[PDB]
Short mmCIF file of C-alpha atoms and ligand atoms in Angstrom, two decimals:
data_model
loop_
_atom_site.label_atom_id
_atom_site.label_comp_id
_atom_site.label_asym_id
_atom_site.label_seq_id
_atom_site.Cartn_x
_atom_site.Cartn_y
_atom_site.Cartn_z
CA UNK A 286 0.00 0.00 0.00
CA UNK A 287 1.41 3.25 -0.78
CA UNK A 288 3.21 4.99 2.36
CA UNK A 289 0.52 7.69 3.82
CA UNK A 290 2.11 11.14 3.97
CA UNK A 291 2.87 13.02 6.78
CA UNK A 292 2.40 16.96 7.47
CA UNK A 293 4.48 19.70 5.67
CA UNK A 294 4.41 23.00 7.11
CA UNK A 295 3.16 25.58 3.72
CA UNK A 296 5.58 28.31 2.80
CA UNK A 297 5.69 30.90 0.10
CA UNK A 298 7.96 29.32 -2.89
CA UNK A 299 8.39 32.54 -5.32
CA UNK A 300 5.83 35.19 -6.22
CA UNK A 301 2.67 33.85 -6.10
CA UNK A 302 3.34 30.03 -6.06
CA UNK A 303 2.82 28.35 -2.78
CA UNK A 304 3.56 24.87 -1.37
CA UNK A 305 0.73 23.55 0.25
CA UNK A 306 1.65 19.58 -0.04
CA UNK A 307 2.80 16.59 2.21
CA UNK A 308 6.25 15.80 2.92
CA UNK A 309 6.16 13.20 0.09
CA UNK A 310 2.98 14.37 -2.24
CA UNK A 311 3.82 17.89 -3.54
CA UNK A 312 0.48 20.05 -4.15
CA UNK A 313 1.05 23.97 -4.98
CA UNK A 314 -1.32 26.85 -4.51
CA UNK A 315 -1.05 29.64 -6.65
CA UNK A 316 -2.83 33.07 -5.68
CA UNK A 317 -4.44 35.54 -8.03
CA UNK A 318 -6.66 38.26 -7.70
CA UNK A 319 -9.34 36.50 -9.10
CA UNK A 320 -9.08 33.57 -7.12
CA UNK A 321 -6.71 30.65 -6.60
CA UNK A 322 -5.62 27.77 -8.62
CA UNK A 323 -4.40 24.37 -7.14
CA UNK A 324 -2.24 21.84 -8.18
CA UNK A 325 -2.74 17.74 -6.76
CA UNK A 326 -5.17 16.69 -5.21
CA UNK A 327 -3.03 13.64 -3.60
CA UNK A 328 -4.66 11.10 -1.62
CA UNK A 329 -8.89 11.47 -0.44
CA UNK A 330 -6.82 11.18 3.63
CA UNK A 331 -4.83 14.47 2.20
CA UNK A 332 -7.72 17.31 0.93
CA UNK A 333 -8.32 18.28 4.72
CA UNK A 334 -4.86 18.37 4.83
CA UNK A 335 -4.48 20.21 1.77
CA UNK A 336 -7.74 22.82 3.09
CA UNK A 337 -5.48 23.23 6.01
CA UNK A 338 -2.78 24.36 4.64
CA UNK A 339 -4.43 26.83 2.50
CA UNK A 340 -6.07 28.28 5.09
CA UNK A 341 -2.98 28.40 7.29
CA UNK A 342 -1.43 30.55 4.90
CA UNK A 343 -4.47 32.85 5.30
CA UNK A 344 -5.98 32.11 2.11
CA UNK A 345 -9.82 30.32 1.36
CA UNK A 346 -10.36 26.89 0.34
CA UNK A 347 -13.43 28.35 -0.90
CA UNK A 348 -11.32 30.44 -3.30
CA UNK A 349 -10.14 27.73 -5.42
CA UNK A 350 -11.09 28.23 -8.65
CA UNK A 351 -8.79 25.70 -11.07
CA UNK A 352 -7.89 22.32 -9.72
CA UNK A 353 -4.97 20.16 -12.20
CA UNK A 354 -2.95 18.28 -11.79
CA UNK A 355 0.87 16.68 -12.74
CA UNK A 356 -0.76 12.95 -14.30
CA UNK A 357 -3.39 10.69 -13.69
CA UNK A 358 -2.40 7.97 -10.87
CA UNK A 359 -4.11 8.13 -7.66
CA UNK A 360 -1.28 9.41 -5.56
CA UNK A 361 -1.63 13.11 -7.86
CA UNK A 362 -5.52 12.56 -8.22
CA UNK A 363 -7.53 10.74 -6.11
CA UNK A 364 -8.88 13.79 -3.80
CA UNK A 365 -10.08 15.73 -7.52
CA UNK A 366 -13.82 14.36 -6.13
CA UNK A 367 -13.84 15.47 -3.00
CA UNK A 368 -12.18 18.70 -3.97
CA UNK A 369 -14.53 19.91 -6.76
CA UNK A 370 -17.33 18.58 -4.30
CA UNK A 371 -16.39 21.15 -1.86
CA UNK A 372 -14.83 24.26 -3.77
CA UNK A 373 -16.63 23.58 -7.12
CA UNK A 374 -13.13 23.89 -8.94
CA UNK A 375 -13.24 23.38 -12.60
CA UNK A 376 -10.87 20.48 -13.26
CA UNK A 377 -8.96 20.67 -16.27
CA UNK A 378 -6.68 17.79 -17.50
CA UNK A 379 -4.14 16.97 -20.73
CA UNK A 380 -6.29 15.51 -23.45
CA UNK A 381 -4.23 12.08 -23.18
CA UNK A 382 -4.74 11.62 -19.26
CA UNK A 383 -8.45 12.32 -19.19
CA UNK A 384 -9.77 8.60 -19.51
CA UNK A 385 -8.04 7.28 -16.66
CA UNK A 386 -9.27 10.44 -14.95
CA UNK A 387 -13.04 9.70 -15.92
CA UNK A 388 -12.32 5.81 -15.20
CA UNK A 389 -11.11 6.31 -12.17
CA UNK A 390 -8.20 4.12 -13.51
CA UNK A 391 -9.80 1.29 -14.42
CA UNK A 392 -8.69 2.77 -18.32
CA UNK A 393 -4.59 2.84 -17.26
CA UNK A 394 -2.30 1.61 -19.68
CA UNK A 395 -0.48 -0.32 -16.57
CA UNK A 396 -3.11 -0.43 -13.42
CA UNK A 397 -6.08 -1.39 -15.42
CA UNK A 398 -6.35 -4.54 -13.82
CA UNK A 399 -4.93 -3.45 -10.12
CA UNK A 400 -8.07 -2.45 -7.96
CA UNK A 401 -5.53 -0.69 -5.50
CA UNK A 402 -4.43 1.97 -7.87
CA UNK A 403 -8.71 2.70 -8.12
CA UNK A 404 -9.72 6.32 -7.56
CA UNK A 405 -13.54 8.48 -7.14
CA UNK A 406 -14.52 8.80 -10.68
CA UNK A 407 -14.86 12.91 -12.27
CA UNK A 408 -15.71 14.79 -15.20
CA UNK A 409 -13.02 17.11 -16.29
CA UNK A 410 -14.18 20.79 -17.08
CA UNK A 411 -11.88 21.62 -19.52
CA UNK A 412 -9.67 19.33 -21.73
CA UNK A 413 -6.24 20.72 -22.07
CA UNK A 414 -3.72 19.95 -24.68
CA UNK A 415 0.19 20.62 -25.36
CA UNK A 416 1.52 24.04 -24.82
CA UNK A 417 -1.99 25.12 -23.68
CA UNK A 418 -2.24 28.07 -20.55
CA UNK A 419 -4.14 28.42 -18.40
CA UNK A 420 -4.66 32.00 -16.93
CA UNK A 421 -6.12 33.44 -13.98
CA UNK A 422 -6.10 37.15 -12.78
CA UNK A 423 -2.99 37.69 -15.09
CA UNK A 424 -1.01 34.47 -14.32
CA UNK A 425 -0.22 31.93 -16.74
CA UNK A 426 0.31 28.56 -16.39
CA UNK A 427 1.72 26.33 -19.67
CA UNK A 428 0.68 22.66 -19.97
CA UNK A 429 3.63 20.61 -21.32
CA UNK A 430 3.07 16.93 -22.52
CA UNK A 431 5.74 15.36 -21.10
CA UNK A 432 4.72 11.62 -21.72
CA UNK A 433 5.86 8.36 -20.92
CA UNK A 434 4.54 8.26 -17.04
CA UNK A 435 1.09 8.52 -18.21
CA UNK A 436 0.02 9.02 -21.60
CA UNK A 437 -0.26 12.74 -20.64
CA UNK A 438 1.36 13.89 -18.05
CA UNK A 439 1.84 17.05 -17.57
CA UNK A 440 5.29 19.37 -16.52
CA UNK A 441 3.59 22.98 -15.77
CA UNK A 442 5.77 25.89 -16.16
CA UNK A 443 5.25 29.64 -14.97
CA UNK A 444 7.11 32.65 -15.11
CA UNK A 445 7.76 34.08 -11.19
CA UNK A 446 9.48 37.19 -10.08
CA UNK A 447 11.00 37.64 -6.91
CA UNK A 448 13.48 40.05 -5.42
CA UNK A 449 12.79 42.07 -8.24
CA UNK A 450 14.59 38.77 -10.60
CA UNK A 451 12.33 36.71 -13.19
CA UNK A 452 12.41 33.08 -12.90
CA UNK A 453 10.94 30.03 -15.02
CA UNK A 454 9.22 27.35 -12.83
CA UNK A 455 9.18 23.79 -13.59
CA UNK A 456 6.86 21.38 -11.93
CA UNK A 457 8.49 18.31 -13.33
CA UNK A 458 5.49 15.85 -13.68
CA UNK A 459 7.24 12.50 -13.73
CA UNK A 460 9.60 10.97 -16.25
CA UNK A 461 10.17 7.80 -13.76
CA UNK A 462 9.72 4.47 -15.27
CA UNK A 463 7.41 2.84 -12.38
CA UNK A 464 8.39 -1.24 -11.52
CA UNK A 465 7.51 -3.70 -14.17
CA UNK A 466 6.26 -1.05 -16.95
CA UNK A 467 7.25 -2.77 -20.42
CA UNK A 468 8.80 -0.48 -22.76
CA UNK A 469 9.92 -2.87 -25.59
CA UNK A 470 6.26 -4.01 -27.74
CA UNK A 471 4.19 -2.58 -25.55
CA UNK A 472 0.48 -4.08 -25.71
CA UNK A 473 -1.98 -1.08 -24.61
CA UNK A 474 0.79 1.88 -24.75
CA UNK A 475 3.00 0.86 -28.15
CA UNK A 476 4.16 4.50 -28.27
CA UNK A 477 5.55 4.53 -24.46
CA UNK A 478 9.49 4.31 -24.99
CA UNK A 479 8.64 6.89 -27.98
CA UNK A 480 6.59 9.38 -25.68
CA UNK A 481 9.67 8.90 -22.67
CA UNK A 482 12.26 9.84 -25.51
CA UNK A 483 9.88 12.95 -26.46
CA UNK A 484 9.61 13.73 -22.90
CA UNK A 485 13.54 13.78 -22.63
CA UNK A 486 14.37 15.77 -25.39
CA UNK A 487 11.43 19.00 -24.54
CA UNK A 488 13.00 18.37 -20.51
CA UNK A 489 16.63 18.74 -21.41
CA UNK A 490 15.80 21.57 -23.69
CA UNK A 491 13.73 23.25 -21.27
CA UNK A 492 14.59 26.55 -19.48
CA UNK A 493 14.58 25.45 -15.72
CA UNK A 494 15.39 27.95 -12.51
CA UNK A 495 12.92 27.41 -10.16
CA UNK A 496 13.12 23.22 -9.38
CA UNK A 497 9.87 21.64 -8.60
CA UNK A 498 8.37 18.60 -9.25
CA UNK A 499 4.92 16.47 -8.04
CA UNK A 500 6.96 14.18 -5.67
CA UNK A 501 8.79 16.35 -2.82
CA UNK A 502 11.77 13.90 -2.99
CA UNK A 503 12.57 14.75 -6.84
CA UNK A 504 13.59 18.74 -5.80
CA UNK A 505 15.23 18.05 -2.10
CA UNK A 506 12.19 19.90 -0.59
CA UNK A 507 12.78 19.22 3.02
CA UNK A 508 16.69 20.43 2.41
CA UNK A 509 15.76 23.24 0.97
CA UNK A 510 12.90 24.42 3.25
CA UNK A 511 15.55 24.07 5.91
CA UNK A 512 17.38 26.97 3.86
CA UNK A 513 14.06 28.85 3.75
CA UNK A 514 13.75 29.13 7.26
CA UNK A 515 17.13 29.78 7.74
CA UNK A 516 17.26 33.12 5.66
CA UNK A 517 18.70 31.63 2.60
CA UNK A 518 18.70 33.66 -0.76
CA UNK A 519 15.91 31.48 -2.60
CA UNK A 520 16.93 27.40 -2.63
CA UNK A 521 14.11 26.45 -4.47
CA UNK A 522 16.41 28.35 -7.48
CA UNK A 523 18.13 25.33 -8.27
CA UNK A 524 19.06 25.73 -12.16
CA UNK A 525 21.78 23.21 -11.77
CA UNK A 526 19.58 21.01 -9.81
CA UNK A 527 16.91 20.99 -12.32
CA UNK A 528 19.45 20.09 -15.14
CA UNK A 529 21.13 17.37 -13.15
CA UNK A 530 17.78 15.66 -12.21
CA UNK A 531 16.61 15.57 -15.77
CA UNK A 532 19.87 14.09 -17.47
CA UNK A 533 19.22 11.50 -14.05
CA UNK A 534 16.03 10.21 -15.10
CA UNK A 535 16.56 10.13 -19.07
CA UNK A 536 19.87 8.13 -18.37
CA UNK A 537 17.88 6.09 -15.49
CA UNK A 538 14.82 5.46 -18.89
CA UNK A 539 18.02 4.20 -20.81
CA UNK A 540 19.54 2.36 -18.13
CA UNK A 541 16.27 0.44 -17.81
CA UNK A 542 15.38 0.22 -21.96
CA UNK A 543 19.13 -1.29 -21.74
CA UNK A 544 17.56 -3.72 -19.03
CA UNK A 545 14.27 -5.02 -21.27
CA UNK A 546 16.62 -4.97 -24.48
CA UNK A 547 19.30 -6.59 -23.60
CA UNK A 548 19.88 -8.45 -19.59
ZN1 LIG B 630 2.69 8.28 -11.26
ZN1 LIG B 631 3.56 9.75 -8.03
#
């Protein structure tokens, strides 16, 4: 069974992008004058967590206008219900992820058939697609297909300025290859190894200051919060950090097409 999250404390990341995750499950909160858009929904056991956090910070649950998220597996997803239930969030979703998100997962190319990976069925509000924004009160969000992980999963960038300095934000969505996914003649997902290379190339090509990602142990988030709280001039600007993870995972995707090709 997956490992249930414990508490993170919420904290300001740059500008108007918040943390308001888990200390594993990474969910962001970003504040606009016209309301607030949230990223993950994590686990059903994390949305009071997630209200809680929110409100900590002083802002309203009831304010959340946009729910996404990074890709469709229950540990990024499975509270979209009981969020849109409560806030009446419009959920919007990459094209490629949506029928998982409308079967709950009983559509995945991989968990189709593994009733533990099951999540509260939605309907998605809006039906996003590569390179697509999505804007509130003058921020913009960019939807980058990023596939492999899921068939759509989704690295969101934004543009941030603090201390008077611009900065591109990456929230890496995934580009892990999970335990026993098949990349060589794949039966449901032929394409997979094809979309992972894809994914690699946009990544490594990618402007990248601002290091996030949808799992808090991809960016060093409890490292870096240490830094926060310690004064330090922003560690969640982590350029170097950002290109070193990538060039990780595409040589860990090689590493394991080496694996199903050849061992
Ligand atoms: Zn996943
Ligand atoms: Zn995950």
């Amino acid at each position: 069974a997956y490992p249930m999250p414990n508490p993170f404390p919420p904290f300001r990341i740059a500008g108007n992008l918040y943390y308001v995750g888990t200390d594993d499950l990474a969910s962001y909160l970003i504040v606009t004058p016209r309301g607030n858009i949230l990223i993950n929904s994590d686990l059903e056991a994390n949305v009071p967590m997630i209200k809680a956090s929110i409100k900590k910070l002083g802002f309203k649950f009831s304010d959340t206008k946009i729910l996404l998220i990074s890709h469709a597996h229950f540990d990024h997803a499975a509270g979209s219900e009981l969020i849109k239930q409560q806030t009446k969030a419009k959920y919007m979703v990459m094209d490629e992820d949506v029928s998982v998100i409308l079967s709950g997962g009983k559509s995945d190319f991989h968990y189709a058939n593994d009733s533990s990976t099951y999540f509260t069925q939605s309907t998605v509000d809006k039906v996003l697609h590569d390179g697509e924004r999505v804007e509130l009160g003058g921020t913009v969000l960019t939807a980058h297909l990023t596939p492999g992980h899921t068939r759509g999963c989704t690295t969101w960038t934004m543009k941030l300025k603090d201390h008077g300095k611009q900065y591109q934000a990456v929230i890496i969505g995934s580009i892990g290859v999970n335990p026993g996914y098949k990349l060589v003649d794949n039966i449901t997902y032929p394409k997979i190894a094809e979309d992972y290379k894809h994914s690699i190339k946009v990544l490594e090509s990618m402007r990248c200051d601002i290091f996030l990602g949808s799992h808090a142990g991809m960016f060093d988030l409890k490292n870096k919060y240490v830094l926060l709280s310690k004064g330090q001039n922003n560690p969640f600007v982590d350029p170097t950090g950002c290109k070193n993870y990538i060039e990780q995972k595409a040589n860990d995707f090689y590493t394991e097409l080496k694996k199903q090709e050849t061992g």
